[PDB]
Amino acid sequence: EIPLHEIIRKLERMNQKKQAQRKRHKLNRKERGHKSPSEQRRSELWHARQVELSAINSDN
Amino acid sequence: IEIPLHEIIRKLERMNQKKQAQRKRHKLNRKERGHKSPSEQRRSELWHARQVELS
RNA sequence: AGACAGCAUUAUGCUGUCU
RNA sequence: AGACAGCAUUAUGCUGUCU
């Protein structure tokens, strides 16, 4: 019968492939400057907050 | 820690249907183009040879 | 001619969490 | 701007096992 560590290494090989795909797709999009509405919302919240935090940093 | 075994079994059942779905799509795609791998050619020749030897 | 599987290369869309 | 994840759609090449 198949030993459990082998099951573990196969899932690990598999997880690695998924991360590689996602990385490839992420970088493709970045290069085309494509974002999803949620990616977009999310960066916009971040940039807004960076501005605000440096407005507390001028209060020094 | 706190994630049931039956969920794991299900998740893997899902992943396995999607793997089978991909073979099917890839397999059929190759059929349309009439494309065989070198090994698929050997196999089919050896089969057709065994079949013609019968008659 | 078919059934099943392994390996490898690779595209696209969206959503959610943390910072 | 990053980190991590989930769903969905989808292309290619090869190898092996059984009949």
Q: How far is CA B34 from the centre of its chain?
A: 16
Distance in angstroms (rounded) separating the CA atoms of residues B52 and B35: 23
Tokens of A30: 């970045």
Which method was it determined by?
A: X-ray
Q: Which nucleotides of D are covered by protein (CB under 7 A)?
A: 1-19
Q: Is B50 exposed, middle or buried (0-12, 13-18, 19+ CB in 10 A)?
A: exposed
A33-55 core/surface letters (b: 16 or more CB in 10 A; e: else): eeeeeeeeeeeeeeeeeeeeeee
CA B30 to CA B41: how far, in whole Å? 13
Topology (CATH) of B1-55: 1.20.5
How far does the CA of A52 sit from the C1' of C8, in Å? 49
CB B15 within 8 A of CB B23: no
How many whole angstroms from its chain centre is CA A40? 13
Strand C and B43 CB separated by under 7 Å: yes
DSSP assignment of B8-54 equals: HHHHHHHHHHHHHHHHHHHHHHHHHHT---HHHHHHHHHHHHHHHHH
Tokens at A46, concatenated: 């971040």
CB of A42 within 8 A of CB of A36?
no
* CATH class assigned to A1-60: mainly alpha
